[PDB]
Amino acid sequence: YDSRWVKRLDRLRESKFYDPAPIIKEEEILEADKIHPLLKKVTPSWNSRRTGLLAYKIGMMSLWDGWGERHAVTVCQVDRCVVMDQRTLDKDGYEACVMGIGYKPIHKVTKPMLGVYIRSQIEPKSRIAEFKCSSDCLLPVGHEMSVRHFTPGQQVFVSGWSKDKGYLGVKKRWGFAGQNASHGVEAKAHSSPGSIGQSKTVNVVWRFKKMAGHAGGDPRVVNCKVFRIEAQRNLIFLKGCVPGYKGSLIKISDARGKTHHRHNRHIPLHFPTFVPEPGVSYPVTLECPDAEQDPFLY
């Protein structure tokens, strides 16, 4: 809430006061204090479908794979994404896992939502969203989702919201061609939309016609490949690009339909989710498998 110049200077000086980097372990063990007592493994049927999860877009970086191929990757963080309730046919008329993520200051939280959070025995949450799933894939209330939910190399269906670009004309909003910059073109026509419909016969402008307006801010879905996961910080590195701002909410779920049939048919997945066994050691960082053939062959 400072002045513009103060915020600019603090942005400039941000780097000088970062915390020292943490020490990332190579292997970790999980005890009963981090495993929900009702979390148990299930073997899926044909109709079984797992739940998604919520993450925050953090940034993007370039990483080398085993062959030396460089991939641009987007880092997302599952910042305390916790199951808060279960939807059921008899109790709610449908089936889903309700998940809360983030932290909101209490002085910004409202009293009834504070009561909900107290009932859930969790800190105040920033956002809450549902994930529809099969009956056998329902997770117990209180379980905390981990990046280990996703096997590296798998395809994931990702949904988000695109950024806002403000008010834009047709040329910038839809890439209209406009007119020539010379040859007698009138000033109003250089970036005009031209004609906008047919003539007296139909006597309308058709719905969904492309015109100027406020650009951006739409729900956008894409596919990504799970490139890497780090369990210590609940970081997931996904190959490609993801809609939204840095710090914006992202839904991540298993690929479906054509993508699943073409990519995920043979990659085993944990059902309902990763179910740790107490006392067993697991790797902290996992990479996707390498390509069989040499990308630099030609």
């Binding site: 719905r207 969904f208 406020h214 801010g217 739409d218 729900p219 956008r220």
Partner: peptide, 29 residues
Amino acid sequence: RWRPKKSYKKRTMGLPSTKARRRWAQMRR
């Protein structure tokens, strides 16, 4: 003059969501 066909403008499936379409759905609710 010769012109490109631009048959992609006739696409009817896989169209991205737009504010116009969402407003249409809201109206039809």
